[PDB]
Amino acid sequence: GAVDEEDFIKAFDDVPVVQIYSSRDLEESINKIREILSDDKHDWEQRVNALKKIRSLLLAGAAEYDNFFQHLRLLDGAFKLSAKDLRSQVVREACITLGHLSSVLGNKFDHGAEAIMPTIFNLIPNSAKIMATSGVVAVRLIIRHTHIPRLIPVITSNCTSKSVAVRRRCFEFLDLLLQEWQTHSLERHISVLAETIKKGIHDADSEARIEARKCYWGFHSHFSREAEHLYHTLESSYQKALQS
């Protein structure tokens, strides 16, 4: 998984150098990208290049312009469409560009991350490895760089999926989030974290339980009081499993 993540990161700037000739020029460039990515029947190679050009623009300093985040909102539909494409080339490029947006904007990717996250979670159970992995890596990159509390319920809600794959990944994501985010980023969501981890500890799946226990101790390190309380509501067998 570390190699796939590194592969995305290396791809971030493997895109053409572009110029931004004005605020108007930037808006029109993003308008053109929206047009290309919003058409179901538009040439797939041209869609890959349009997704790459978003990275080009970031590298040209687009994020500095007054209206940039207005422009980025406009691409909500484009990202969803791209991440749902039949062609993994398009899906994968979209996930790379989403990861790049997160790494460049950090916490200012708050709106875009929340808007696209359910769509990329829908990749997780795909039986095609390239499809699933692209979505997994995009989520991990977003969690790593965009520490936004509103993302926590989106992630935890998938803890309870009928798809075992989604459940396993969910607790992998949660483990990563607890390890990467500061305590203050978690304080509005203590209860939902505790209940989500509680459900994972009792999960029917063995791999899911193992990840949930990682989550428990991550959670404990932030909130020992609340984690100890959760611990003592557990039957004896689960308490011993946690101590292992």
Numbering used by the authors: 295 to 538
What does the paper say about this structure?
CLASP1 TOG2 in a different space group, P21, as compared to the initial structure that was determined in the space group P212121. Native diffraction data was collected to a resolution of 1.78 Å, was 98.1% complete overall, and was 85.4% complete in the 1.84–1.78 Å high-resolution shell with an average I/σI of 2.8 in the high-resolution shell. The crystal contains two protomers in the asymmetric unit. CLASP1 TOG2 is 65 Å in length with a bend between the HR A-C and HR D-F triads that orients the HR D-F intra-HR loop surface at ~30° relative to the plane established by the HR A-C intra-HR loops. This deviates significantly from the flat surface observed across XMAP215 family TOG intra-HR loops used to engage tubulin (discussed further below). Comparing protomers determined in the P21 space group to those determined in the P212121 space group showed little structure deviation with low overall Cα pairwise rmsd values that ranged from 0.3 to 1.3 Å. Collectively, the bent architecture of CLASP family TOG2 domains is conserved and reflects a key structural state of the domain.
Two prime animal MAP families that bind tubulin and are recruited to microtubule plus ends by EB proteins (either directly or indirectly) are the Cytoplasmic Linker-Associated Protein (CLASP) family and the XMAP215 family of microtubule polymerases. While XMAP215 family members promote microtubule polymerization, CLASP family members promote microtubule pause, potentiate rescue, and limit catastrophe.
